[PDB]
Structures are given as C-alpha cells and as structure tokens.
A paper describes a structure:
The spliceosome, a multi-megadalton ribonucleoprotein (RNP) complex, catalyzes nuclear pre-mRNA splicing, where introns are removed and exons are ligated together. Highly dynamic RNA–RNA and RNP networks form the active site of the spliceosome through a series of compositional and conformational rearrangements driven by RNA helicases, providing the necessary flexibility and accuracy of the splicing process. To ensure fidelity, the spliceosome needs to recognize and discard suboptimal pre-mRNA substrates while it assembles, is activated and eventually catalyzes the pre-mRNA splicing. Here, we provide high-resolution cryo-EM structures of such so far undetected spliceosomal intermediates that contain suboptimal splicing substrates, isolated via the [name] [name] from the thermophilic eukaryote [name] ([name] or ct).
We could resolve the ctILS structure at an average resolution of 2.8 Å, with the variable local resolution, ranging from 2.2 Å in the core region to ~10 Å in the periphery. In this state, we could clearly trace the U2, U5, and U6 snRNAs, as well as the intron-lariat RNA. The absence of mature mRNA within the U5 region confirmed that this is the terminal [name] complex. Additionally, we could unambiguously position the [name]–[name]–[name] complex, which is responsible for disassembling the [name] complex in the following step. As observed before, [name] is associated with [name] and [name] via its helical bundle and forms a coiled-coil interaction with [name] via its long α-helix32. Similar to previous observations in the metazoan structure, in the ctILS structure, we found the [name]–[name] (G-patch domain) complex docked on a surface provided by [name], [name] and [name]. It engages the 3’-end poly-U stretch of the [name] as substrate, which emerges from the U2/U6 helix II into the RNA binding tunnel of [name]. [name] is observed in a closed conformation, resembling the ATP-free form of previously reported RNA-bound DHX37. Thus, [name] appears to await ATP binding in a closed apo-state, ready to unwind the [name] by exerting its pulling force by successive cycles of ATP hydrolysis. Taken together, our ctILS model shows a high compositional and structural similarity with the recently published [name] structures, suggesting a high degree of conservation of spliceosomal structures among [name], C. elegans, and higher eukaryotes.
Numbering used by the authors:
A (entry chain Cc): 51 to 764
B (entry chain Cb): 237 to 299
C (entry chain D): 135 to 198, 205 to 235
C-alpha cells in the first residue's frame, strides 16, 4: 500500500503527492472522488505544497518546529495531512493532534480535513470539543481545542496517544494555549519521540524560536490585495462620532464598497447604527445619497444577525448615481478570521472591549482599551480581501507606532490561574514556579491561585493535590463549582446544585432586547424567585424542563419567556455531563422535597459552601452598597438581580467592574450559615479588617452562646 | 486545617501586598519562585499582572 | 505676529485683522446651520430624557430591608425548632 511504501520520518514530498493523487486512498482502503481530486489540486496550487518538502525536511531534522505563514496559505489543513503521512500512524499506533483556539474553528478544520482526505467525519479525521468528542478508534488526525488539549494533558501528561502535535493560531496568546505550549516543551525535553509544531501568522517567529530553544523556523510566502492605510490628523475624543462622520464621508465621496467600522459595545453599536440610519435617511432626503444597509456585529448578535451582516450590500436608488453600501459596525468579530465579501473601506476607532482580571481584588471586567499594532494589522488585512481596499484609523501614525503595543495582552495575565495550577498538580508539576513555561504568570498571581486552591481544598498547605483536588481536576468545571457539586451531597440538593453549576458554566440565558425590554422584565419577574438570582435561574431551568416534558417547542418557549434556547441546551448538556461524572465518581444525587421548607435553606448553604470566597455584606441599613470580603471590595447589586430585598450576606457568582461597581448573580445567605459552611476561610482568629469580620465574629459568639445554652438545657 | 491567610492582602493605601506567610507564597517558595523575577524556564515571563486602562467610552486610540 | 500687527496693511491695502475676521466669518457661516441643528436635537433629547425620568418615577410611585428579612427567617426557623421540641417533649395543651 501507499502507507507501507512511505517510510516514517523519511517520506518525500513527491511520494506524498503521488499517494494523494493515487486513485486508491489507503486511509480506509477507498476510492478517490472528484471532490477529493479537486481538493488535492487546490492544495497543490496553494503555497503549502510548494514548501511541503522543506516542511517535511524540517520536521525530520528537528523534533520541534515553527511554521510562520499568512492566512489562507494552508497551514491549518495541508501541514497536518503531510505530518500524518510522514509520521505513518498505522505503524506507530499514536494519533496526530491539532490544537486550535476555538472549538468551532477546530470542528471546521476537522471537517475540511475529512473532506480533503475523502473520509467520514469522526472515522479518520476527528474533532474534540467541550462535552463533544466526535472521534473513533481509527482516527489518525484529531482537531481539539486548547482546553481539550489541557484536559488531555491533565488526564495523561505522558501524551503517549499523540505522536505529533501541531498548535495553530498561537498568536492569540491564550492561557490554555500557553499551558499546552509549556506542556509540549516539557514533553519534548523529556522524550524526543514526540513531534511539536507551532503554526503562527505574526512576526513572532523569533520569539517562538527563543521559547522553543532555537527551533527550526519555516516561512510560507504569499501576498494579497493592497490596502492603503490612512491615519487621522489628530486624536479624536468622540470615537463614535468620528466613525459616523468617516462612514458618511465614505458614502458621500468614496467609491463603491462595503465599510466595516470598529465599535466597542453592543449598546454603543446599536446607537451608532441608529444614528447612521438617521444620517442616511437625511442624506437621501437632502443630497439624494445612495442606499446604506446597517448591520451590527457586536458581542451579542444572533445567527440571523450574522447572516444579515454577511448578506450583500443594497443596490443604488438610481442607475449612474451613488452606489449602495453596506456599513457593518463590528466589535471584534471582523478583526480576525472573518471573510466579508465586498468589504473595501475600514474605519478603525482604535478602541475595543477586552477582558481583564485584576488579582489585587480578584475582579474581572470588560473594559475599553486602546488597540494594538497586531489588531490594526488584522483589521487592515481583513479590509480589502477580494480587491484593493482602504483602512482609515482614528489615531495618529506616531501614536500607533509608539503608544499602541505590538501584541495584545495574554489570557494568562487577563484571567486567573487556579484551573491551570490544579491541572499542573493533577499532571504532576510540583514545581510550578520552576516549570518550563515560556511566558509564565506573575508570582503574586500564582500565589493567589494556590491560596484560592487551598481555600477550596484543591491543594494542601504543602501544595500537594488531594483527592478533592483530583476530583476537581477530573470535573470539567471551575474549582468552586466542583467544590459546590461535592458539598451538595451533604446539603441533599445535588440535582439543583448541579443544574445551577451547569447554568453558571453555560452563557447567560436571559435575553433583554432594547425593543422588548418591558417583555423581558415581565418574563424575568414571572420566572424569578425571591431567594436569589441563582434561585431564579434554577426556577427558569425547571420551567424550561417542564415545558420540554409537556412537549412545547424549546425555541418558541425561550422566545416567549425571553430565554436563550442555545444557552438552555448548553446548560442541559453540562448538567448531563456533570451527572455522568458524578455517577462515575460515586457522588450521590439527592434533592430536597418541594413541600419541605428547608430546600431553599439547603440550596443557600450549598451555594455558600461552594462560593464562600465571593460573599458581600451590607455596609449599613441606610446604604445599599455591599462590602465583599475579597480584599474589602465596595460594590453594589446588579440591576438584573431578582432579589427585591437585599440580603445580609450575598454570595455572588460573578463580579463585574464598570463605571458603577455592581455584583450579579447574588444569592441570599446569612453570616452564621457562611461560617458554618466555610469555618476555615471565615475563621475569626485569622479574620482581618474590618467591621464585617467583627460582625461575623459576633455572630459566631452568638452561635457559640446558643450552643452552650442548648447543651445546658439538654 | 489552619486558616491560611490571603496572598494578596489589601493595605490602607489600596495596594495589594504579597504576604509571605500565605499558603500560596509558601508553595511558590518551595517551587523556587524569586522576588522581583518572573517564573518559567528562564524567568522571561511577566513579573506583574495586566493592568486594565480606564479609557473613556467612545474615545479613540491615543486620546 | 499678524495678531500683533492686526491694524497694519497688506500689499492690496487691506488690514490683517480684516483678513482674519473674513476667514473667521467664513468658518462661522460654514459651521452655523449644523451646530444650530445639533443644539436643536440636543434640547429635544435632553428634555425628552427629563420627561422619561418623570414617567419612570411616576411608574415607581404607581407600583410603589435586610435586617428585616433575615430577622423574619431566623424567627421562622426558631419557631419551627420550638414546634419540634414542643411535640418532642409533649406540650399538647390546646383547646
């Protein structure tokens, strides 16, 4: 056969091309089709096959390699097929791994690889995602997310099931991608039989080689259509107004072509779209300008909105007049991995919404920050795809050269590392500080993550992983959610706590449209509970399950109740996965009776045990401002909270830092219940400032006096 | 189990100090963390966390 | 320097301050209608928002604490505990 004729780590590019062009495909002993032949011809015409011989030589001569190439060159698809052909997985028994940043992108790449190889999806080419493993025992190439690769490394850090691993889209600098890169570097240092490939599209090839200790770097050439870059004469305070004026000027004077504008938020994008529609109506009324189709692509858009954004531009009102234009106000979707046909003009305000987690108070926020040079280059590359384009930025050239950073901040510094520390402890990395990491996090952040793990009983005082930490690492959720699910058997509310944890892991299901805000508020009040936002979410999930059992349409019921059907399905799948994991681990599933009055108290106690770290207490009876004990954070309650009366203790699942500091997803709890749930974290002997800890100590003294009175009376 | 103190203790000036008596600090010291130097194979990582800039809403780059 | 010598003359016998004021009035005539419209809908939107605040307070009146609610919860659990100890000790004295 072709695989038997090809040698491991010695297959030539001509031999691989002959095996691909052969009428008998030996992956499953099948016959090649016309679509497979067309895909092979396209891969040969692409620049990946021109440098395929050099890539194979570099992979044979070096265990770790870096390939830097432009988008569309074929590094995501043609490199893995050639790597698998050179590795010959039938003679080794180990598969090929393709690490990707996005699960949907990994699934699309796996489907494209299966279509190119003329094999069924999951048989030879497989896809691995969160709670979705579409693979079989005969799979040789598997595309998996960075989180899936991290979970596989935590399950078995030896990585014996994978012979060659290629991590693509490494320029995103994700925390899981960095952890996977560190694990791959450690595996390459331990055993030389594993092949490591790093695919990049930026100018960080030298940095990647320095991280991989002078790995062989292969550059894939290939250009695209030209883009003329223009800069504003000065920095504008009103970025939205400047973008609106630039879009109006492009519609009035510039030639035909779609224009993509860089916005920051969903409400700002909607307001800008309304203003652009009013301006286009005024221009049509006065100067008889051409038609303009406004399309929003912010962080909260539906598939219908995405299809309307990807739809064609409107036609001109009259022949020979101003041509029609499509103004797509996108937030960050169109910056990278987006192909919009007809896009010619780009408006870059230089501001985008990025997520940052400050470890000083452990507060996560989505703040508007200045754009980077990499983001500007990505926007310029997105503009002018099929033809020559123009990209105008609202910042000076000197400002973009100096003030704008070369690369964006990484997700390791933008988020916490408690899950990474738990995964390293499960895999066996005792020396986390001395671990071979190219871009490790801060020592203060690592100490905070280890302290959080010790508070959640993921690690002991010496940093060793206990059985609770092993169970938390095995469970595909946060350590706090795993601790809540573990402690739910004591509270006898295991099913409700698992549903709440699944809903917290899944995205927000509450839909509050601007034109249906009253209907959304009415639905939230109908499906809400006075115990807390977690109780309201549990009641909404129970109502959705009851509607599904009764036979009503899930999407129609979600639309009627202002809910998200996709988020509800994701929460149901996460709850099913958590129940399967609990059944595998022997965790009992119990639920309190509905007629029992202690069900809400048990649920509140389980929530307090799960998330006792994020607990806030009211500063005064006349003040609505709460004081979270995490570094004494003064915050408020979010307006989406369903609790009409604020509680003495509010356990908050999420903390959002904005212009007004508010806490969302707050459940009612008492200080005595919190101290009973977590006596180690809420110890009065180690209690610091201030009066909140003094009140907790007073409540503990009152509980001790009550216990003494009960012992005296008994 | 002893009540482990928080690693990032907020002072009266609003700054978070790394308490060396914390369990996380003890684990980092046992692993080989050095004060003023980042972790990793060669210590090339960032020694400080990413700070979010409080830029105005609807404000362009460089403003 | 032209501002210092605004009363001096050009070669065509025209005062530098008149050149400057002609340019400034040209700019003012170019900008005046659009800023008139801007302040017009600024007034409209501003006192429309004032109106909307007034009906949101009207609706708040139309439809109308923490120590209170946890005091209610604690006396409820204490009354339940009293109930269980009462029929654990046999305190049936109803009529």
């Amino acid at each position: 056969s072709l695989l038997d004729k090809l040698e491991r780590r010695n297959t030539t590019a001509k031999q691989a091309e002959a095996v691909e062009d052969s009428d008998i495909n030996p992956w499953t002993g099948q016959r090649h089709s016309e679509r497979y032949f067309k895909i092979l011809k396209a891969r040969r015409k692409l620049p990946v096959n021109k440098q395929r011989q050099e890539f194979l030589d570099l992979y044979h001569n070096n265990q770790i390699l870096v390939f830097v190439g432009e988008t569309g060159s074929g590094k995501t698809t043609q490199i893995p097929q050639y790597v698998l052909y050179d590795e010959l997985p039938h003679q080794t028994g180990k598969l090929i791994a393709c690490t990707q940043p996005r699960r949907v992108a990994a699934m699309s790449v796996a489907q494209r690889v299966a279509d190119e190889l003329d094999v069924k999806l999951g048989e030879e080419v497989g896809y691995s995602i969160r709670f979705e493993n579409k693979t079989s025992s005969k799979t040789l190439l598997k595309y998996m997310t960075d989180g899936q690769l991290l979970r596989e490394a935590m399950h078995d850090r030896d990585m014996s099931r994978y012979s060659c691993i290629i991590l693509d889209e490494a320029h995103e600098r994700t925390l899981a991608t960095d952890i996977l890169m560190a694990l791959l570097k450690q595996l390459s240092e331990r055993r030389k039989d594993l092949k490591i490939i790093v695919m990049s599209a930026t100018l960080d090839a030298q940095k990647f080689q320095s991280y991989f200790f002078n790995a062989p770097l292969l550059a894939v050439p290939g250009r695209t259509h030209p883009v003329e870059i223009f800069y504003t004469p000065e920095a504008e305070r009103d970025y939205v107004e400047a973008a609106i004026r630039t879009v109006l000027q492009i519609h009035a004077c510039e030639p035909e072509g779609d224009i993509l504008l860089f916005l920051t938020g969903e409400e700002e994008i909607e307001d800008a779209c309304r203003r652009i529609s009013l301006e286009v109506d005024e221009m049509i009324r006065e100067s008889d300008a051409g038609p303009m189709s406004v399309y929003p692509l912010y962080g909260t858009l539906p598939p219908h909105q995405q299809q309307r954004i990807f739809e064609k531009a409107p036609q001109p009102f009259r022949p020979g007049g101003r041509p029609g234009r499509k103004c797509i106000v996108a937030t960050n979707i169109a910056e990278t991995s987006l192909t919009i046909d007809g896009i010619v003009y780009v408006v870059d305000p230089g501001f985008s919404k990025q997520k940052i987690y400050n470890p000083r108070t452990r507060v996560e926020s989505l703040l508007v920050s200045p754009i980077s040079k990499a983001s500007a280059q990505q926007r310029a590359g997105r503009a002018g795809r099929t033809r020559p384009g123009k990209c105008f930025r609202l910042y000076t050239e000197e400002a973009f050269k100096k003030e704008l950073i070369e690369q964006t901040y990484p997700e390791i510094l933008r988020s916490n590392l408690s899950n990474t520390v738990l995964e390293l402890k499960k895999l066996g990395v005792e020396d986390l500080v001395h671990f071979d990491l190219m871009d490790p996090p801060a020592p203060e952040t690592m100490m905070r993550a280890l302290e959080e793990l010790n508070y959640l009983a993921c690690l002991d005082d010496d940093g060793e992983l206990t059985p609770l930490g092993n169970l938390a690492s095995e469970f595909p959720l946060d350590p706090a959610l795993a601790v809540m699910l573990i402690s739910s058997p004591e509270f006898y509310c295991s099913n409700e706590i698992l549903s709440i944890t699944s809903l917290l892991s899944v995205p927000q299901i509450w839909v509050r449209p601007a034109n249906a805000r009253k209907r959304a508020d009415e639905m939230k009040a109908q499906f809400a509970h006075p115990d807390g936002d977690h109780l309201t979410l549990l009641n909404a999930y129970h109502a959705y399950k009851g509607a599904e059992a009764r036979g009503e349409d899930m999407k129609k019921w979600c639309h009627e109740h202002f809910l998200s059907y996709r988020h509800l399905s994701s929460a149901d799948n996460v709850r099913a996965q958590l129940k399967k994991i609990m059944e595998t681990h022997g965790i009992e599933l119990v639920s309190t009776p509905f007629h029992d009055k202690n069900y809400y108290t048990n649920i509140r106690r389980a929530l307090l045990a799960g998330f006792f770290m994020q607990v806030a207490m009211r500063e005064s009876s006349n003040s609505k401002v709460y004081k979270t004990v995490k570094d004494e954070q003064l915050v408020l309650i979010h307006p989406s909270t369903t609790v009409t009366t604020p509680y003495e203790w509010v356990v908050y699942n999420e903390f959002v830092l904005t212009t007004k500091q508010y806490v969302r997803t707050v459940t009612n709890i008492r200080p005595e219940w919190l101290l009973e749930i977590a006596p180690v974290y809420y110890d009065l002997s180690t209690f610091q400032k201030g009066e909140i800890k003094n009140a907790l100590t007073r409540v503990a003294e009152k509980i001790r006096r009550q216990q003494a009175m009960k012992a005296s009376k008994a | 189990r002893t009540a482990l103190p928080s690693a990032f203790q907020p002072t009266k000036d609003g700054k978070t100090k790394i308490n060396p008596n914390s369990f996380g600090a003890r684990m980092l010291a046992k692993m080989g963390y050095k004060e003023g130097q980042g972790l990793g194979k060669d210590g090339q990582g960032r020694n400080v966390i990413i700070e979010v800039n409080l830029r105005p809403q609807g404000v362009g780059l460089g403003a | 320097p032209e501002e210092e010598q605004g009363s001096s003359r050009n070669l065509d016998g025209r005062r530098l301050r008149t050149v400057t004021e002609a340019k400034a009035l040209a700019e003012y005539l170019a900008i005046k209608p659009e800023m008139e419209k801007r302040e017009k809908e600024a007034r409209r939107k501003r006192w429309q928002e004032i109106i909307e605040m007034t009906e949101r307070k009207q609706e708040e009146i139309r439809n109308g604490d923490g120590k209170w609610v946890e005091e209610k919860e604690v006396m409820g659990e204490r009354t339940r505990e009293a109930v269980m100890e009462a029929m654990k000790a046999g305190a049936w004295k109803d009529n």
